[model samples]
Target: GSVVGGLGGYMLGSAMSRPMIHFGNDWEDRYYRENMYRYPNQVYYRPVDQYSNQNNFVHDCVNITIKQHTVTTTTKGENFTETDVKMMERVVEQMCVTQYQKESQAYYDGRRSS
Candidate 1:
């Protein structure tokens, strides 16, 4: 048995308010996607470094475990469900985090040293 953890953060722009308050289930997907892609470099969550001054935090992360469930009954029909949990995290980071951080650190170092 093994356990894994993850940490991430996203921004909730003001545009999210429309979906959240007006349309409950209908707007969930759009809302989630907006926040996920809003702020790529900054982590707004921190369990240990709570004062890091980042925009968002996700220290709790996520733990993934694999288990087998015994079939309780025979199924005659097909069933489908969509979680929308995508594996596009790498693409997001490459497109956002790396570039954002590189530029930010360079700016900070230059300001402090000069």
Candidate 2:
């Protein structure tokens, strides 16, 4: 009896009318409204005008001024040649970006080996 009643109601509802569920002002609408601020040259001014700010461009070469007294600095005075120092600086900078590259390569190699 319960099964037949549910089926009958469903058929009656489908035949009598279109959907009662409306789409306007729903969560999907709100999500699109929020994400619309993520565009170029905008800083996401929330709850106001979305994204608005001042814009300008300045490119120049000027001498910078700084005031400081004599500051004493000391190292162990580890003597090394200019070539050695250059090599060390190069190795240090390379470590920053190369670490992720090496890691991704290892990951790919491991995947291929297995």
Best by lDDT: 1
Ten residues in sequence with the least summed lDDT for candidate 2: 60-69
Cα deviation of 105, candidate 2, in Å: 13
| Global lDDT of model 1 | 0.29
RMSD to true structure for each model, in Å: 13.0, 33.3
lDDT of each: 0.29, 0.25
Please provide, for model 2 over 67-87, each residue's C-alpha lDDT reduced to its tens digit, 9 standing for 90 to 100: 000011112323444443333
Error of 2 at 8 (Å): 74
Q: TM-score: which candidate is best?
A: 1
**TM-scores for all candidates?**
0.25, 0.20
lDDT of 1 by residue, 2-93 (tens): 12132233221112111122224656546555654432222211222223432331111111100000011113332212232221233222
Clashing pairs in 1: 6-61, 43-56, 44-56, 44-57, 45-56, 45-57, 45-58
